Nucleic acid binder design. Structure first.
Ligand SMILES: Nc1ncnc2c1ncn2[C@H]1C[C@H](O)[C@@H](COP(=O)(O)OP(=O)(O)OP(=O)(O)O)O1
Ligand SMILES: Nc1ncnc2c1ncn2[C@H]1C[C@H](O)[C@@H](COP(=O)(O)OP(=O)(O)OP(=O)(O)O)O1
Ligand SMILES: [Zn+2]
Ligand SMILES: [Zn+2]
Lengths: 434, 430
RNA sequence: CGC
RNA sequence: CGC
């Protein structure tokens, strides 16, 4: 089989069935989507894309199931189970759009507030499209997979279930749905890859040692469910991982300028949406916000759309182009403040678009000259339990931030924007900004 | 000052003038050109672009020039001098085209064999274009630079001189011309040695920090040359070895070079049908964008995706080559050879080679089926000093086939071996 | 506001 | 033929 040499995992061995899924346009698309979205414009080392991360997730998913399979043959983990987990690891991010999280986290809710969309649902659709347009089903049979149920298994590891809700594997293998993405504690192999990979590219330092965690993991009975468990001695490695997670969020994922830049890209896309045409199945033409509705079109929707707007000459694209040009010139939106919702609702995606109006409609009655419209405000909604076993008894067990930026960079609008912001938070009973 | 946190160097401090140069479309362009070109298709960690490298080179350039001047005040090293050497470091790669070296190393020769072009020449043109499009001359003045002679000094660091052939700085500051690009020891190699090892997972045994703090300018044959300390000779060996490990394992990688030639082939078949708008509304091709910097500003690795996502029927041939890269149905390796004792093959003759292979001889193959790739790399000449006496010192040629059946593959092998006989080249191994 |  |  083939070896891919990754700076984080060294030599990666890929089963020939994984190679065939990788060597498709639907998987090679991930080479053109930056892992950290606009974070590259803030961190020059963060040039990595979804592709190499996905190889890493596919690789760690395998190492874990194969480690668990050797130390616990009573789990009856087949080599078909291994491949289904690796495929799910490879393919979990297939549905990511331009600038990863900025696309489904901010662009799609602002452009189509009525539509519900996640990158995970995109991954399922893209995976189904990847199989159908490349004849992967026979290659799966050739290598021992049973397509109808194994494809069901792979999709459920990605997006979740549609008593025991799953239908790809029975209850005696429930621990398999915990590897690729863990919806119950947030410890999965995908986190392991990008902690290490993002640290590597940001120059932040990573104390967590994923290999020791794999070496000592075990499946155990916890409330009559089979769950993967860490050794009781290894709590120190887990403390390190959580500290790395907190550093990456505080330093990189929630960086002030990096988030501002994400909203500028989203602004440019929104101004371009009516004029960019992406050709989907049958020659039908889609927009940036509607490419998610046709997988052929989505395949051709990547970070490229930044440069296609930046390089365009079309007069209708001028407004969008000038937003991208201000990023290059480093004339960004200006930070106004921050807040938190007090024991309150999740500010919901359907409401993201109404937010700039509320801020402008707020009444700071300490009245000054300048007044601002909704188009001048950006509102940024940033959305953000381990069982152990002792070695003497091996199968016995033991939120939202809201930033406001202003598109006008004068002293007076920024002074006024602050007054509107401080007023808006009182209206909704948010914490006082300062 | 503004700080940029880089994984190779930690914190980089940028003088306000450098920020002004960096925050232009001409410099930001470098975010959209892979440092290793097609090598990303073999090394998934090699996603790095020319931009981050260029910041490293400016940083390393300042470190060296600043450490010399503080340790040897007799060198008369101004802050004008430091800023100029930083700008030269920041901008030395401004002229790189799509997929870095694959552009001027193979494409421009195959598309316009008449013209003799280098990315360094592009960097001079792109720099001049950068300075005028963003009003950098007044900013240079408000920070103590004399633009007319300093722009010459920056240009000369990047491309070289047109007796003392330089006109940006006098001979008593000859050493300043050795920092950005040189004997082959300069800060540019230092950054990409470290940067490439970091993304490739190869180990870099050279420590540039140790070389920097122990470096001294000394007189050697009437010229002031930058000299390493005697005890750093072991560091120099490690430097020369990681350089050679990077070329043999990464830059001259077999599949990555094959992929580079597939992109080049795609570009030549797309060349007559892509239009890039340059100054005055004039239109240019991938091959002529080099003659107009406004157009060149918009020619990045994005030209790869424009072809790949194109629907024009006239771009189908180029599109299908790129689509063959995604599927991993690549050209096939036939063999390797070298011009032993022979005249090195020159760029102007690159396009003649695929027909010379079909020339020299059941199934027979035409020039269309042959790719000929010419791989170029480009002890002494480095002087050391002792502590007690601190002022005195002491081509590859590969052939690929486009038809991948075993019958055409064995045929192309014989075309190749015979072609080397006619041209006095080595007989390939197995 | 590439602290 | 991302040894
Ligand atoms: N708020 C965020 N939470 C988690 N990951 C984020 C966030 N913002 C950016 N990222 C990056 C971190 C990783 O590189 C990557 C993880 O993607 P996924 O697992 O799909 O969620 O996204
Ligand atoms: N033949 C080659 N020689 C040197 N560097 C090369 C070669 N091919 C690719 N590279 C890469 C190595 C560095 O990352 C970068 C050096 O760019 P340069 O302008 O030569 O300085 O290009
Ligand atoms: Zn992921
Ligand atoms: Zn360079």
């Amino acid at each position: 089989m083939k070896v891919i040499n990754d700076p984080i995992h060294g030599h990666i061995e890929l089963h020939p069935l994984l190679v065939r899924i990788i060597d498709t346009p639907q998987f090679q698309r991930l080479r053109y989507i930056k892992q950290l979205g606009g974070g590259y414009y803030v961190f020059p080392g963060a040039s990595h894309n979804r592709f190499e991360h996905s190889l890493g997730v596919g690789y760690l998913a395998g190492c874990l199931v194969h480690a668990l399979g050797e130390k616990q043959p009573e789990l009856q983990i087949s080599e078909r189970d291994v491949l289904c987990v690796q495929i799910a690891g490879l393919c979990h991010d297939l549905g990511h759009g331009p600038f990863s999280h900025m696309f489904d986290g901010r662009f799609i809710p602002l452009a189509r507030p009525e539509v519900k969309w996640t990158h995970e649902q995109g991954s399922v659709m893209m995976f189904e499209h990847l199989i159908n347009s490349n004849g992967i089903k026979p290659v799966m049979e050739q290598y021992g997979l049973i397509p109808e149920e194994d494809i069901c298994f792979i999709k459920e590891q990605i997006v979740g279930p549609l008593l025991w809700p799953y239908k790809g594997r029975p209850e005696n293998k429930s621990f398999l749905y915990e590897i690729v993405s863990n919806k119950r504690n947030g410890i999965d192999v995908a986190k392991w890859d990008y902690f290490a990979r993002d640290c590597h590219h940001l120059g932040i330092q990573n104390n967590f040692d994923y290999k020791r965690f794999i070496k000592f993991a075990r499946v155990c009975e916890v409330d009559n469910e089979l769950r993967i468990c860490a050794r009781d001695k290894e709590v120190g490695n887990l403390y390190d991982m959580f500290h790395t997670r907190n550093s990456l969020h505080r330093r990189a994922y929630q960086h002030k300028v990096g988030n501002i830049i994400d909203t500028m890209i989203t602004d440019a896309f929104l101004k371009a949406d009516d004029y960019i045409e992406i050709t989907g199945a049958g020659g039908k033409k889609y927009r940036i916000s509607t490419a998610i509705d046709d997988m052929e079109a989505y395949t051709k929707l990547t970070d490229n759309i930044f440069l296609e707007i930046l390089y365009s000459t079309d007069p209708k694209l001028k407004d969008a182009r000038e937003i991208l040009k201000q990023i290059e010139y480093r004339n960004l939106f200006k930070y106004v403040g921050e807040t938190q919702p007090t024991g309150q609702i999740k500010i919901k995606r359907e409401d993201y678009e109404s937010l700039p109006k509320e801020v402008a409609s707020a009444k700071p009655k300490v009245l000054l000259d300048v007044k601002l419209k909704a188009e001048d405000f950006i509102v940024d909604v940033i959305n953000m339990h381990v069982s152990f076993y002792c070695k003497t008894a091996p199968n016995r067990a033991i939120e939202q931030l809201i930033r406001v930026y202003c598109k006008k960079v004068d002293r007076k609008s920024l002074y006024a924007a602050r007054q509107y912001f401080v007023q808006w938070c009182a209206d909704r009973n948010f914490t006082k900004p300062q």
